[PDB]
């Protein structure tokens, strides 16, 4: 059964270099062309090159976006394909997939690895500040009220959020993080509850940012007048 | 380069219905050099269809493709729950290899207007020198919506960021947040902060607002 495992990703500063490895098993690696495809966060798929088999010359092709910066090679004795990534820029941040190129006249990408994330950034590790998204005093008496937590200015990903240590899940919406222009991430987590519970029920968001060893329990209540 | 334009951007259908996805190429490309891929969030793409009649190994019968030259179609004859995902077309007959921008197949439901909530910046954040104002659009459908920040009736542009949840597994709605970022000094010289929301289910825009420094 075909297996493709990518490795070598991670965080790297702009202008530095990285080499990705894709270890292949379950097929005759040397018989197949191999190809790398990347997917920037929230965007589509972009081909970044292929390498032919030894029987077909073993040479490569890549698009202009990475030409002169990325180089693909292969080690048939180890069944590994490589992606040498030089002169890295922030726009190169993406999940990188190695793919096996199908044989014959229709050379589609028949098998894909799980991919390895490459993050290009100069940001330093930083824990988030957790601010309350407090419900309003205009909340409909006998209706529904929204409240939440703003998890601001952290690096790197990820941040996990739960409510009341996992006891509260209904009405909870934890939004995908956004990358700010400062290079730091921010996200919010909100929940909708009956307005009548604002005076009796306690609502606490539990924020964990393991890269900075940050654990925060934040109680959110109606701002005092 | 051959540009691949997929349409529609999102198709909204129910389980058991027929899905018809289009992929138009900016230049003529033979059917031998076209492929279709499926991708679910957090997972790698997988090959579905390639060439004139080739189907990837293990791909069910309900996936089929047709078309030649510039117009290609992917058909899912009967949508199963696992078929709701993003679908990409790809051409590899010309260098560089290119992919379409992707078509999302989503669960269809009745129209639901968003519930709108506005959150002023907390006093704790103001201590740090910045102010974030958040507008929440809760449990709406379809996904398309417009959020407009107004500060003393001045429309804000270029200083906000939006984030959208995935389609909710039970009620099939979306939720959206918009975060307006200002300096503490800019925040403190204005009074009325409002987010104005428009949606195809709303006959007129919905406005939620607060006055700075008012309970």
């Amino acid at each position: 059964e075909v297996q493709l495992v990518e490795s070598g990703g991670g965080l790297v500063q702009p202008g530095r270099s990285l080499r990705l490895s894709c270890t292949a098993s379950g097929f005759t690696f040397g018989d197949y062309a191999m190809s790398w495809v990347r997917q920037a966060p929230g965007k589509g798929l972009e081909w970044v090159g292929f390498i032919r088999s030894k029987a077909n010359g073993g040479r490569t092709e890549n698009p202009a976006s990475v030409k002169g910066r990325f180089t693909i090679s292969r080690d048939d004795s180890k069944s590994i394909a490589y992606l040498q990534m030089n002169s890295l820029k922030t726009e190169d941040t993406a999940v990188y997939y190695c793919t096996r190129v199908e044989l014959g006249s229709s050379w589609s990408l028949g098998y894909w690895g799980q991919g390895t994330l490459v993050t290009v950034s100069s940001a330093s590790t930083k824990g988030p500040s957790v601010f309350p998204l407090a419900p309003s005093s205009k909340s409909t008496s006998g209706g529904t009220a929204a409240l939440g937590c703003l998890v601001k200015d952290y690096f790197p990903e990820p941040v996990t959020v739960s409510w009341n240590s996992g006891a509260l899940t209904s009405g909870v919406h934890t939004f995908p993080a956004v990358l700010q222009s400062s290079g730091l991430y921010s996200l919010s987590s909100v929940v909708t509850v009956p307005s009548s519970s604002l005076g009796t029920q306690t609502y606490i968001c539990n924020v964990n940012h393991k890269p900075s060893n940050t654990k925060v329990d934040k109680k959110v209540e109606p701002k005092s007048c | 380069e051959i540009v691949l334009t997929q349409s529609p951007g999102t198709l909204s259908l129910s389980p058991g219905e027929r899905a018809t996805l289009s992929c138009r190429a900016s230049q003529s490309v033979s059917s031998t050099y076209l492929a279709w891929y499926q991708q679910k969030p957090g997972q790698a793409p997988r090959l579905l269809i390639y060439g004139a009649s080739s189907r990837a190994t293990g791909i069910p019968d309900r996936f089929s493709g047709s078309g030649s030259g510039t117009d290609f179609t992917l058909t899912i004859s009967r949508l199963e729950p696992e078929d709701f995902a993003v679908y990409y077309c790809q051409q590899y007959g010309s260098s560089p290899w290119t992919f379409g921008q992707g078509t999302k197949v989503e669960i269809k439901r009745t129209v639901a207007a968003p519930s709108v909530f506005i959150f002023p910046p907390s006093d704790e954040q103001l201590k740090s020198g910045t102010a974030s104002v958040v507008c929440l659009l809760n449990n709406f459908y379809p996904r398309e919506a417009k959020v407009q920040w107004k500060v003393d009736n001045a429309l804000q542009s270029g200083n906000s960021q939006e984030s959208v949840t995935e389609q909710d597994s039970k009620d099939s709605t979306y939720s959206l947040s918009s975060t307006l970022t200002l300096s503490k000094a800019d925040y403190e010289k204005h009074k009325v902060y409002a987010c104005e929301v428009t949606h195809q289910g709303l006959s007129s825009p919905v406005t939620k607002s607060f006055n700075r420094g008012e309970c």
Binding site: A33, S53, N56, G57, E61, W107 | G93, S94, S95, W97
Partner: peptide
Amino acid sequence: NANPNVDPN
């Protein structure tokens, strides 16, 4: 050359 299955020499 867009063909990965033939040596272009």
